[PDB]
Design an enzyme around this catalytic site. Structure first.
Site, PDB file in Angstrom:
ATOM      1  N   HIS E 200       0.806  -1.206   0.000  1.00 15.69           N
ATOM      2  CA  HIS E 200       0.000   0.000   0.000  1.00 15.69           C
ATOM      3  C   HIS E 200       0.841   1.259   0.000  1.00 15.69           C
ATOM      4  O   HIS E 200       0.356   2.367  -0.312  1.00 15.69           O
ATOM      5  CB  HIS E 200      -0.997  -0.017   1.147  1.00 15.69           C
ATOM      6  N   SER E 204      -0.361  -0.255  -6.625  1.00 17.26           N
ATOM      7  CA  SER E 204      -0.097  -1.343  -7.541  1.00 17.26           C
ATOM      8  C   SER E 204       0.630  -0.980  -8.828  1.00 17.26           C
ATOM      9  O   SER E 204       0.448   0.098  -9.372  1.00 17.26           O
ATOM     10  CB  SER E 204      -1.408  -2.056  -7.868  1.00 17.26           C
ATOM     11  N   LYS E 226     -14.615  -7.072  -9.706  1.00 14.60           N
ATOM     12  CA  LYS E 226     -13.741  -7.797 -10.595  1.00 14.60           C
ATOM     13  C   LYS E 226     -12.974  -8.800  -9.766  1.00 14.60           C
ATOM     14  O   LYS E 226     -12.279  -9.639 -10.298  1.00 14.60           O
ATOM     15  CB  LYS E 226     -12.820  -6.845 -11.362  1.00 14.60           C
ATOM     16  N   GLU E 270       4.538 -34.043  -4.384  1.00 16.14           N
ATOM     17  CA  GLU E 270       3.338 -33.566  -5.096  1.00 16.14           C
ATOM     18  C   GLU E 270       3.754 -32.698  -6.299  1.00 16.14           C
ATOM     19  O   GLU E 270       4.802 -32.059  -6.277  1.00 16.14           O
ATOM     20  CB  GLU E 270       2.410 -32.798  -4.154  1.00 16.14           C
TER      21      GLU E 270
HETATM   22  C1  HEM Z   1       0.656 -15.933   0.937  1.00 15.45           C
HETATM   23  C2  HEM Z   1       0.715 -15.898  -0.581  1.00 15.45           C
HETATM   24  C3  HEM Z   1       0.509 -14.503  -1.180  1.00 15.45           C
HETATM   25  C4  HEM Z   1      -0.541 -13.704  -0.992  1.00 15.45           C
HETATM   26  C5  HEM Z   1      -1.733 -14.005  -0.106  1.00 15.45           C
HETATM   27  C6  HEM Z   1      -0.368 -12.580  -1.688  1.00 15.45           C
HETATM   28  C7  HEM Z   1      -1.368 -11.499  -1.686  1.00 15.45           C
HETATM   29  C8  HEM Z   1      -1.100 -10.410  -2.675  1.00 15.45           C
HETATM   30  C9  HEM Z   1      -2.155  -9.424  -3.015  1.00 15.45           C
HETATM   31  C10 HEM Z   1      -3.547  -9.367  -2.491  1.00 15.45           C
HETATM   32  C11 HEM Z   1      -1.570  -8.528  -3.994  1.00 15.45           C
HETATM   33  C12 HEM Z   1      -2.257  -7.364  -4.657  1.00 15.45           C
HETATM   34  C13 HEM Z   1      -3.163  -7.906  -5.754  1.00 15.45           C
HETATM   35  C14 HEM Z   1      -2.322  -8.422  -6.897  1.00 15.45           C
HETATM   36  O1  HEM Z   1      -1.414  -7.759  -7.380  1.00 15.45           O
HETATM   37  O2  HEM Z   1      -2.551  -9.512  -7.350  1.00 15.45           O
HETATM   38  C15 HEM Z   1      -0.190  -9.000  -4.189  1.00 15.45           C
HETATM   39  C16 HEM Z   1       0.718  -8.285  -5.101  1.00 15.45           C
HETATM   40  C17 HEM Z   1       2.151  -8.673  -5.028  1.00 15.45           C
HETATM   41  N1  HEM Z   1       2.731  -9.756  -4.340  1.00 15.45           N
HETATM   42 FE1  HEM Z   1       1.823 -11.142  -3.277  1.00 15.45          FE
HETATM   43  N2  HEM Z   1       0.821 -12.652  -2.445  1.00 15.45           N
HETATM   44  C18 HEM Z   1       1.360 -13.893  -2.006  1.00 15.45           C
HETATM   45  C19 HEM Z   1       2.617 -14.540  -2.475  1.00 15.45           C
HETATM   46  C20 HEM Z   1       3.549 -13.593  -3.152  1.00 15.45           C
HETATM   47  C21 HEM Z   1       4.600 -14.032  -3.841  1.00 15.45           C
HETATM   48  C22 HEM Z   1       4.941 -15.495  -4.072  1.00 15.45           C
HETATM   49  C23 HEM Z   1       5.263 -12.988  -4.291  1.00 15.45           C
HETATM   50  C24 HEM Z   1       6.500 -13.002  -5.128  1.00 15.45           C
HETATM   51  C25 HEM Z   1       7.566 -13.823  -4.420  1.00 15.45           C
HETATM   52  C26 HEM Z   1       4.658 -11.890  -3.911  1.00 15.45           C
HETATM   53  C27 HEM Z   1       5.205 -10.540  -4.238  1.00 15.45           C
HETATM   54  C28 HEM Z   1       4.099  -9.646  -4.669  1.00 15.45           C
HETATM   55  C29 HEM Z   1       4.293  -8.536  -5.381  1.00 15.45           C
HETATM   56  C30 HEM Z   1       5.644  -8.054  -5.857  1.00 15.45           C
HETATM   57  C31 HEM Z   1       3.113  -7.947  -5.598  1.00 15.45           C
HETATM   58  C32 HEM Z   1       2.881  -6.672  -6.377  1.00 15.45           C
HETATM   59  C33 HEM Z   1       2.124  -6.998  -7.664  1.00 15.45           C
HETATM   60  C34 HEM Z   1       1.926  -5.779  -8.540  1.00 15.45           C
HETATM   61  O3  HEM Z   1       2.046  -4.682  -8.070  1.00 15.45           O
HETATM   62  O4  HEM Z   1       1.645  -5.890  -9.727  1.00 15.45           O
HETATM   63  N3  HEM Z   1       3.525 -12.168  -3.078  1.00 15.45           N
HETATM   64  N4  HEM Z   1      -0.005 -10.077  -3.399  1.00 15.45           N
HETATM   65  C1  LIG Z   2     -11.435 -11.350   5.321  1.00 15.40           C
HETATM   66  C2  LIG Z   2     -11.714 -10.704   3.958  1.00 15.40           C
HETATM   67  C3  LIG Z   2     -11.536  -9.181   3.997  1.00 15.40           C
HETATM   68  C4  LIG Z   2     -10.377  -8.716   3.104  1.00 15.40           C
HETATM   69  C5  LIG Z   2      -9.156  -8.193   3.891  1.00 15.40           C
HETATM   70  C6  LIG Z   2      -7.928  -9.080   3.628  1.00 15.40           C
HETATM   71  C7  LIG Z   2      -7.557  -9.123   2.103  1.00 15.40           C
HETATM   72  C8  LIG Z   2      -7.366  -7.717   1.650  1.00 15.40           C
HETATM   73  O1  LIG Z   2      -6.539  -6.913   2.017  1.00 15.40           O
HETATM   74  O2  LIG Z   2      -8.325  -7.408   0.694  1.00 15.40           O
HETATM   75  C9  LIG Z   2      -7.907  -6.674  -0.534  1.00 15.40           C
HETATM   76  C10 LIG Z   2      -9.016  -6.980  -1.543  1.00 15.40           C
HETATM   77  C11 LIG Z   2      -6.433  -7.165  -0.872  1.00 15.40           C
HETATM   78  N1  LIG Z   2      -6.090  -6.730  -2.236  1.00 15.40           N
HETATM   79  C12 LIG Z   2      -6.660  -7.098  -3.373  1.00 15.40           C
HETATM   80  O3  LIG Z   2      -7.469  -8.008  -3.430  1.00 15.40           O
HETATM   81  C13 LIG Z   2      -6.362  -6.452  -4.669  1.00 15.40           C
HETATM   82  C14 LIG Z   2      -5.481  -5.415  -4.882  1.00 15.40           C
HETATM   83  C15 LIG Z   2      -5.308  -4.924  -6.184  1.00 15.40           C
HETATM   84  C16 LIG Z   2      -6.008  -5.446  -7.282  1.00 15.40           C
HETATM   85  C17 LIG Z   2      -6.897  -6.505  -7.106  1.00 15.40           C
HETATM   86  N2  LIG Z   2      -7.655  -7.147  -8.033  1.00 15.40           N
HETATM   87  C18 LIG Z   2      -7.683  -6.843  -9.426  1.00 15.40           C
HETATM   88  O4  LIG Z   2      -6.991  -5.960  -9.837  1.00 15.40           O
HETATM   89  C19 LIG Z   2      -7.080  -7.013  -5.796  1.00 15.40           C
HETATM   90  O5  LIG Z   2      -7.865  -7.942  -5.675  1.00 15.40           O
HETATM   91  C20 LIG Z   2      -6.452  -8.681  -0.969  1.00 15.40           C
HETATM   92  O6  LIG Z   2      -7.206  -9.370  -1.618  1.00 15.40           O
HETATM   93  O7  LIG Z   2      -5.557  -9.196  -0.099  1.00 15.40           O
HETATM   94  C21 LIG Z   2      -5.997 -10.509   0.527  1.00 15.40           C
HETATM   95  C22 LIG Z   2      -4.831 -11.490   0.487  1.00 15.40           C
HETATM   96  C23 LIG Z   2      -6.197  -9.882   2.012  1.00 15.40           C
HETATM   97  O8  LIG Z   2      -6.552 -11.135   2.735  1.00 15.40           O
HETATM   98  C24 LIG Z   2      -5.663 -11.254   3.853  1.00 15.40           C
HETATM   99  O9  LIG Z   2      -4.878 -10.340   4.060  1.00 15.40           O
HETATM  100  C25 LIG Z   2      -5.730 -12.458   4.730  1.00 15.40           C
HETATM  101  C26 LIG Z   2      -4.508 -12.419   5.642  1.00 15.40           C
HETATM  102  C27 LIG Z   2      -7.062 -12.406   5.496  1.00 15.40           C
END
Ligand code: HEM
Ligand SMILES: CCCCCC[C@H]1C(=O)O[C@H](C)[C@H](NC(=O)c2cccc(NC=O)c2O)C(=O)O[C@@H](C)[C@@H]1OC(=O)C(C)C
Ligand code: HEM
Ligand code: HEM
Ligand code: HEM
Ligand code: HEM
Ligand SMILES: CCCCCC[C@H]1C(=O)O[C@H](C)[C@H](NC(=O)c2cccc(NC=O)c2O)C(=O)O[C@@H](C)[C@@H]1OC(=O)C(C)C
Ligand code: FES
Lengths: 49, 60, 241, 49, 378, 79, 378
Positions: E200, E204, E226, E270
């Site tokens: 944050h 993004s 979305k 796996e």
């Molecule tokens: C516990 C597994 C993970 C969760 C729950 C998680 C959750 C998220 C979420 C909600 C976002 C913003 C939405 C999105 O860009 O898709 C994000 C973006 C990102 N995550 Fe994760 N992610 C996880 C594993 C990773 C991994 C494997 C990496 C890379 C090693 C990573 C590095 C990033 C980065 C760099 C972004 C920025 C994406 C962008 O700005 O385009 N996170 N992640």
């Molecule tokens: C309990 C549900 C309330 C939500 C609060 C927690 C969840 C939370 O923080 O919500 C927002 C939705 C967070 N970001 C996004 O989704 C998101 C960000 C940029 C773009 C897109 N999509 C398409 O462009 C996204 O979808 C996201 O998706 O992160 C999850 C991993 C997180 O979930 C967590 O932490 C877990 C540790 C709970």
């Protein structure tokens, strides 16, 4: 000069009940909203199940 | 004579009250009718059930 | 021995996507289990009650349960007698100690049958083929004692006697107990002894497809609505002069 | 393991200095017809077939 | 005044998915962040319902799972959703990291790095996960792997037996793993929030790598819906497995209990560790094999130090775009080899794929970058 | 964190937009849809496809030689 | 520039216990917040090490614990620290709530309320905790209690059997409780942070109830070291039990396994529920008894609605100061009665103590408050 600013034509995107510049949109107000809300009502009915 | 969707909006969709009331009322009847038609479709394409097998064992 | 062959695609009555098992055929199969396999093959997980909704009925299940005698709980003197048969307990049968399976069938373990269809690659067909497969050893070859021949088998040297064609029966109403008819039925039952949920699973699966079939389009039309403001937006750049 | 006359001779013929862990077969057994081993692979502990 | 903005709690929620400005620009490759979230909770959620019926104890381990599948009302869908959700959690994790490299997202150091920490932990978790039912794959899977620490000079032995609770895998090892498989996803869940916290700070990245400050849209409508549609798609897939093909991605032999005497010539972790598996054994070394296995994943944390290009996304970079896909296909190769026995073709090709992997990420992509600079006159 | 109003500086751009209840959610879904995905596919085949057929060729040849290595093995052993 | 202030992570840590301004004024009654924290982690920490050895399954339940105490290297200190830490977690919880009423802290609605949620959850947790070893107290403790929901009109029966997994306490009930006893402390830990979040919104109250803005000191030195010393004291106590009197607060009969046939005429929940126990049975009613038991704790959430005084702390309020101690002693009474059999003196006195409790909090303290106002001319 800001009076040169006409809003670009949208006929290309408009719902059909709204194509006529001479027709009040209040007539299709209900129908149009109804449809989209029906869409979400059904949807949510679906998640509900 | 307006439209179905129009009349539908006025009487039930306008207020979030009736709107929500409509969907809880509409979900009950949907769960029932969808489960009927569905299972029926599931049986019609089958028939090696335990349904048509019972006729044979009303005794013991 | 190093080379191998894999099974064909027998068109089971439950191979298709939304296809239930043949309950009439699951029945005959249990029969094949009880009379034949049960004296060598443990089936620790299935029980007489499990059969209740599936093939048999209430009273029928009781009766089949009563045709054996299991060692019930100890009594006041620390007994452990025997009793008719409930519905409750399973099919723990052939041998106590695992090595006692080896002492009988020469050094070979006839593994649990609850397993089977999901523990061997190919599933039903491998068991179907392994049973109705049984062929004769060509040249080269050997064998120890009666380490019978089977192509659909790792190494081709099994320790299992081919208890297929010994035409046993009780196919109520009238069913020819031929080798092949007997093999389909065991398998069909063995499928159900591994994945009981099988039919419900696919019943739900139908609803899952049918539900998503209304939802996917809908929850998609919803997102369109909201993004349409962005999708048809018009830009104009009007710098000074 | 009960080794046959053929196996004993084969191990005695192996070029020792080319081995990763240099050892003569006769210093790994007490009676040439018997090899006794821990069924544990030195890489990651799996069971050798 | 709008309570949705000044209330200590809502603030967080307003900042998370209501008022947060996001690129009008992101596409489907950005959904896997919600999907991973969803995955994480659904996993935590079915996982818990299995724990109200599961056991531990080597004697009852396998028995309890079958108990659930057959006896526990609906235990089967729960069990299979858990096991299939686990795979989906990898498909997304994989896709997420993918999206990341292509688009240059890794330039957010802290965020990327927390994500690597998020990768190792869910890997470490899912590993312990499959040891639980106490099947054949569970036993030697739990053996072939863990051992690796025995390659560590001087103390390898000590550690592998310390993680074991004995001299082999038994009593002490199943209860241990269950407990760890229980506490990890909570810890992960925390780390996720910190991941998201650091995210944050910059907002993004987007398909162009340019900078969307000039055109941000509110998370409200837009990305919430979305995300919903998206999640529905993830449900379709997870349910397709569970309800039509429950064991398609599952090794049929984790059925049939354990047996320290056996070991069924085949055995592979796996699917989601296959590429890694391939790497390790594509090296005739105990130390080298495991050393190479580590680098295979820990190299992600190296990527940012080899950004060489003057552009951020690969959206306008044909040369690198080619090397990206060559990487993916090559990983699909490693996955395939990993799945095969260590014999004739399979050895040398999986040995080439390994070298390729490291040479591609360490030399090829960084050079493709510089040439593109030079081509553009940058 | 960063809020609207403190993002960045924008000079002279007008943005016309329309209510969702006033337009179609699927303007020319197929009419304009298909042509475009053809266009995007075309625009990218050459960078995505090649590595995959390469894997594809190596996968079929790889299993081939794996069977023909053992099964085909004998072959000849004549004396 | 000082990174300790601008780094997304440290901020939180700077705000928690470094730069946060606190009253130069607080005294020992403010330590129990760290102590509860410490308690929570230490509990989570020993609790986890027991889970790497514990089981579930009614057959092995008791056996595993003894296994730990006798066989597991050091399993005994871990086991006993866990069981004794559990009591300490109540002593502090109790003291905390105490500090709270006396000093008027409850005026921070959200914070107080989160704290009530924190109370019920650790209660709900510790309850499940003692069912685990599967001793006599564990079985009927798990029975006498749970049942209570069977007093709920029309659906009581359904729920009590739903929470049971059968028609009595067995198989389904031990695994359930273990899993819940595992996931709860994590959830609590979250809630704690929200508790603490809302607390930072106002800063801390103090012995005078006045307002210390005019004299704040940095948490740095001051309250960090006054928290360390404090924690050392908590260690002394926890260790005194574990290392000198392990079963002093423990019912000796949770030893000797379960037995749905028995029930040893005595049986009371662990000490920390005695006051509550006393209340419930000091009422000749299934519905009333449990209804009264609930009110016994849920009344804390009522306290703020009966603040009647014009001063915040009781520091300058002799009248209320007296009714406060009368409350404490009276709770010490309920605890004592709860510990006795339902016979002659014990009945009527525990019946009086109950009425007192509710009449004191609901009528006496609120009136004492108004009279003090009137005395001061307010
Ligand atoms: C516990 C597994 C993970 C969760 C729950 C998680 C959750 C998220 C979420 C909600 C976002 C913003 C939405 C999105 O860009 O898709 C994000 C973006 C990102 N995550 Fe994760 N992610 C996880 C594993 C990773 C991994 C494997 C990496 C890379 C090693 C990573 C590095 C990033 C980065 C760099 C972004 C920025 C994406 C962008 O700005 O385009 N996170 N992640
Ligand atoms: C309990 C549900 C309330 C939500 C609060 C927690 C969840 C939370 O923080 O919500 C927002 C939705 C967070 N970001 C996004 O989704 C998101 C960000 C940029 C773009 C897109 N999509 C398409 O462009 C996204 O979808 C996201 O998706 O992160 C999850 C991993 C997180 O979930 C967590 O932490 C877990 C540790 C709970
Ligand atoms: C229709 C009833 C039977 C069926 C369906 C059945 C099926 C099977 C199957 C599928 C296997 C394992 C195959 C594999 O490893 O891939 C097996 C192993 C065996 N069963 Fe049977 N069998 C049946 C009756 C018997 C009988 C009557 C005997 C007693 C001779 C028997 C003794 C064995 C033995 C000895 C093995 C060991 C084979 C080996 O692993 O070497 N089984 N059986
Ligand atoms: C803390 C919530 C979780 C709990 C309570 C939990 C508990 C369990 C239990 C008791 C089992 C054995 C029952 C079974 O095999 O079906 C299991 C299996 C497994 N779970 Fe979890 N787990 C949780 C989170 C996870 C996570 C985060 C993952 C990683 C995606 C995960 C992946 C697995 C895997 C891979 C298995 C074994 C595979 C299989 O079922 O065949 N679970 N889990
Ligand atoms: C999970 C158990 C709890 C933890 C970990 C916890 C943690 C804390 C901490 C660290 C403080 C600040 C330091 C202090 O004043 O002592 C505090 C203050 C407070 N807590 Fe809790 N507490 C817990 C249970 C409670 C309970 C039972 C209540 C009352 C129902 C409560 C309501 C309050 C209130 C009102 C304050 C403000 C104290 C003041 O300003 O003087 N919390 N708590
Ligand atoms: C999530 C971390 C925790 C884990 C993993 C955990 C796990 C366990 C296990 C396996 C037992 C049975 C072994 C034994 O009785 O010694 C147990 C007993 C218990 N623990 Fe926990 N628990 C945890 C947090 C808590 C919390 C928050 C409390 C409440 C202070 C708590 C209080 C108890 C109690 C009262 C018992 C039974 C009393 C006794 O040992 O006689 N534990 N716990
Ligand atoms: C991991 C250790 C780092 C600390 C961060 C977490 C811990 C935390 O936030 O630290 C500060 C120290 C927090 N407040 C106080 O201690 C505190 C506040 C006013 C006065 C005193 N003392 C004497 O007047 C205090 O001691 C406090 O003590 O809350 C704990 C419950 C919390 O602990 C928790 O959240 C748990 C959920 C972890
Ligand atoms: S070769 Fe690696 S474990 Fe045996």
């Amino acid at each position: 000069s800001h009076t040169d600013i006409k809003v670009p034509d949208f006929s290309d995107y408009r719902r059909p009940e709204v194509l006529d510049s001479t027709k009040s949109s209040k007539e299709s107000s209900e129908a149009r909203k109804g449809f989209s809300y029906l869409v979400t009502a059904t949807t949510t009915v679906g998640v509900a199940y | 004579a307006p439209t179905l969707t129009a009349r539908l909006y006025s009487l039930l969709f306008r207020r979030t009250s009736t709107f929500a009331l409509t969907i809880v009322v509409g979900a009950l009847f949907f769960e029932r009718a969808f489960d009927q038609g569905a299972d029926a479709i599931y049986e019609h394409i089958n028939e090696g059930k335990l349904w048509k097998h019972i006729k044979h064992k009303y005794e013991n | 021995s190093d080379l191998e062959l894999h099974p064909p695609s027998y068109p089971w009555s439950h191979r298709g996507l939304l296809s239930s098992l043949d309950h009439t055929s699951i029945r005959r199969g249990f029969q094949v289990y009880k009379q034949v396999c049960s004296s060598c093959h443990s089936m620790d997980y299935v029980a007489y009650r499990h059969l209740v909704g599936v093939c048999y009925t209430e009273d029928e299940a009781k009766a089949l349960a009563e045709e054996v005698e299991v060692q019930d709980g100890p009594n006041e003197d620390g007994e452990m007698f025997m009793r008719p048969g409930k519905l409750s307990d399973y099919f723990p049968k052939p041998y106590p100690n695992p090595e006692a399976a080896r002492a009988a069938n020469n050094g070979a373990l006839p593994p649990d049958l609850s397993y089977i269809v999901r523990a061997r690659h190919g599933g039903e067909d491998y068991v179907f083929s392994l049973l109705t497969g049984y062929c004769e050893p060509p040249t080269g070859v050997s064998l120890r004692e009666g380490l019978y021949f089977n192509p659909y088998f790792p190494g081709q040297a099994i320790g299992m006697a081919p208890p297929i064609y010994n035409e046993v029966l009780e196919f109520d109403d009238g069913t020819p107990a031929t080798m092949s008819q007997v093999a389909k039925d065991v398998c069909t039952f063995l499928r159900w002894a591994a994945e009981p949920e099988h039919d419900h699973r696919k019943r739900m699966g139908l609803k899952m497809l049918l539900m998503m079939g209304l939802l996917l389009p809908l929850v998609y039309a919803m997102k369109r609505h909201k993004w349409s403001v962005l999708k048809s937006r018009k830009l104009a750049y009007r710098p000074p002069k | 393991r009960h080794r046959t006359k053929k196996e004993i001779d084969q191990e005695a013929a192996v070029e020792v200095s080319q081995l990763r862990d240099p050892q003569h077969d006769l210093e790994r057994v007490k009676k040439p017809e018997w090899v006794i081993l821990i069924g544990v692979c030195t890489h990651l502990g799996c069971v050798p077939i | 005044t709008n309570i949705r903005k000044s209330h200590p709690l809502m603030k967080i929620v307003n900042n998370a998915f209501i008022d947060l400005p996001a690129p009008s620009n992101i596409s489907s490759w950005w959904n896997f962040g919600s999907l991973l979230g969803i995955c994480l909770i659904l996993q935590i959620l079915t996982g818990l319902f299995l724990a109200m019926h599961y056991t531990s104890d080597t004697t009852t381990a396998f028995s309890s799972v079958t108990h659930i599948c057959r006896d526990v009302n609906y235990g089967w869908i729960i069990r299979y959703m858990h096991a299939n959700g686990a795979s989906m959690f990898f498909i997304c994790l994989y896709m997420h990291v993918g999206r990341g490299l292509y688009y240059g997202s890794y330039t957010f150091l802290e965020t990327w790095n927390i994500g690597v920490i998020l990768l190792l932990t869910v890997m470490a978790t899912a590993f312990m996960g499959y040891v639980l039912p106490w099947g054949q794959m569970s036993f030697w899977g739990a053996t072939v792997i863990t051992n690796l620490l025995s390659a560590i000079p001087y103390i390898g032995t000590n550690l592998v037996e310390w993680i074991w609770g004995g001299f082999s895998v038994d009593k002490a090892t199943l209860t241990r793993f269950f407990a760890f498989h229980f506490i990890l996803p909570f810890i992960i869940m925390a780390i996720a929030m910190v991941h998201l916290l650091f995210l944050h700070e910059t907002g993004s990245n987007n398909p162009t790598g340019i900078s969307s400050d000039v055109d941000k849209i509110p998370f409200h409508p837009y990305y919430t819906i979305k995300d919903i549609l998206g999640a529905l798609l993830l449900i379709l897939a997870l349910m397709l497995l569970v309800l039509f093909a429950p064991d398609l991605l599952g090794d049929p032999d984790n059925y049939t209990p354990a047996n320290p005497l056996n070991t069924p010539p085949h055995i592979k972790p796996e699917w989601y560790f296959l590429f890694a598996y391939a790497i390790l054994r594509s090296i005739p070394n105990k130390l080298g094999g495991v050393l190479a296995l580590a680098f295979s994943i820990l190299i992600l944390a190296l990527i940012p130090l080899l950004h060489t290009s003057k552009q951020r996304s690969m959206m306008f970079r044909p040369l690198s775009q080619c090397l990206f896909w060559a990487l993916v296909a090559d990983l699909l190769t490693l996955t395939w080899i990993g799945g095969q026995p260590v014999e004739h073709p399979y050895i040398t090709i999986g040995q080439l794929a390994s070298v390729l992997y490291f040479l591609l990420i360490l030399v090829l992509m960084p050079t493709a970058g510089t040439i593109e600079n030079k081509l553009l006159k940058w | 964190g960063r809020q609207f109003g403190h993002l960045t500086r924008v000079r002279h751009v007008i943005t016309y937009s329309l209510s969702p209840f006033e337009q179609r959610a699927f303007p020319h879904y197929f009419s304009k849809g298909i042509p475009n995905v053809l266009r995007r596919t075309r625009a990218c085949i050459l960078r995505v496809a090649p590595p995959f057929v390469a894997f594809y060729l190596v996968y079929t040849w790889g299993t081939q030689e794996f069977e023909k290595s053992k099964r085909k093995n004998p072959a000849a052993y004549e004396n």
